[PDB]
């Protein structure tokens, strides 16, 4: 009975969530890229975030995560977009700054050392 009630509640919530977005754009807006939101596209997330559909795809390519990085590499962003639904689903999954992309970067194993210390040091 509890499982049936939970399933009914989940279905009702999912049905209500459809076509009820009602998200709003502020007088003038921008983020991540910095330049201007209204110049390329309107990839918008909740909790007030804005992206250009290009800065976000640049972030995932530069992100330290491996499986997601190679998963997008099948299309190479140039091979074939097909119906673009696959790219739309892949790109729009995280907030960009409030998600695991930046949380998993608080240790910074990267330390660029290429014997260049002999030049710009000592």
């Amino acid at each position: 009975i509890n499982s049936k009630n939970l399933k009914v509640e989940i279905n009702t919530e999912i049905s209500k969530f459809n076509e009820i977005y009602r998200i709003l754009e502020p007088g003038k807006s921008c983020d991540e890229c910095g330049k201007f939101l209204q110049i390329k596209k309107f990839i918008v997330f909740p909790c007030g975030h804005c992206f250009h559909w290009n800065c976000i795809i640049r972030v995932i390519l530069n992100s330290n995560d491996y499986n997601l990085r190679q998963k997008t590499e099948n299309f190479l962003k140039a091979k074939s977009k097909h119906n673009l639904n696959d790219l739309e689903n892949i790109i729009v999954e995280k907030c960009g700054l409030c998600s695991d992309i930046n949380i998993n970067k608080i240790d910074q194993p990267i330390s660029i050392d290429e014997t260049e210390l002999a030049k710009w040091n000592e």
Partner: peptide, 29 residues
């Protein structure tokens, strides 16, 4: 720190649409 950060991240989706400022999370991270 990782566990606390992801727990806090799973503390904003269920919250109200526009009632809590998101600058604190970015500043802490």
């Amino acid at each position: 720190q990782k566990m606390l950060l992801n727990a806090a991240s799973y503390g904003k989706a269920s919250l109200q649409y526009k009632s809590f400022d998101a600058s604190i999370f970015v500043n802490a991270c």
